[PDB]
């Protein structure tokens, strides 16, 4: 079988409430969607200053997504990319294949921003309306633990999901990944 390549890695570190769980080593395609992958990478390094450092996971729905990210506000329509406020969707080349894929949460057509969502099951309801730009490659148990916290009526976790660290990990030779899950 066939699959896309990878170019860069990020080592997102979550902390549930007052506890630390692990290290979700990500994986980002850098030759199929060149732009959004630059958005995420440059934004996750604290380059300009609008970093993901000390962000909030607002929506945690039990079995569809774990989406959350905003440094301006804490849960609202807060968002600020580097290309302005709205960078056009570029190519819907891949489709969500089961657990553990990363795609951009838009608000319509040509209204992207900085709000990433990790999928937990196959989610074909949305397909071709959202651009996917990365696959996780480690630490599913961390997502499993962060997905099982007591939620509220408005999907906000009762406790807080603080992202306490990030950065860059480089790979010097693009390898390949499969196309089913994990």
């Amino acid at each position: 079988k066939k699959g896309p390549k990878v170019t860069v890695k990020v080592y997102f570190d979550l902390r549930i409430g007052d506890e630390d769980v692990g290290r979700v080593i990500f994986g980002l395609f850098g030759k199929t969607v060149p732009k959004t992958v630059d958005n995420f990478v440059a934004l996750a390094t604290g380059e300009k200053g609008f970093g993901y450092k000390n962000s909030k996971f607002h929506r945690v729905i039990k079995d569809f997504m774990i989406q959350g990210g905003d440094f301006t506000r804490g849960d609202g329509t807060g968002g600020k990319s580097i290309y302005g406020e709205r960078f056009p969707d570029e190519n819907f080349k891949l489709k969500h294949y089961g657990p553990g894929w990363v795609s951009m949460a838009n608000a319509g057509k040509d209204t992207n921003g900085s709000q990433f969502f990790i999928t937990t099951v196959k989610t074909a309801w949305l397909d071709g309306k959202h651009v996917v730009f990365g696959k996780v490659l480690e630490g599913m148990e961390v997502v499993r633990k962060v997905e099982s916290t007591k939620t509220d009526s408005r999907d906000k976790p009762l406790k807080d999901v603080i992202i306490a660290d990030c950065g860059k990990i480089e790979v010097e030779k693009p390898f390949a990944i499969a196309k089913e899950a994990a």
């Binding site: 729905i61 569809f64 329509t77 949460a105 838009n106 608000a107 969502f117 949305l126 959202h130």
Partner: peptide, 11 residues
């Protein structure tokens, strides 16, 4: 329903 939007959250 099950959408992932930023601003007008729908059903």
């Amino acid at each position: 329903x099950l959408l992932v939007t930023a601003g007008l959250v729908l059903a």
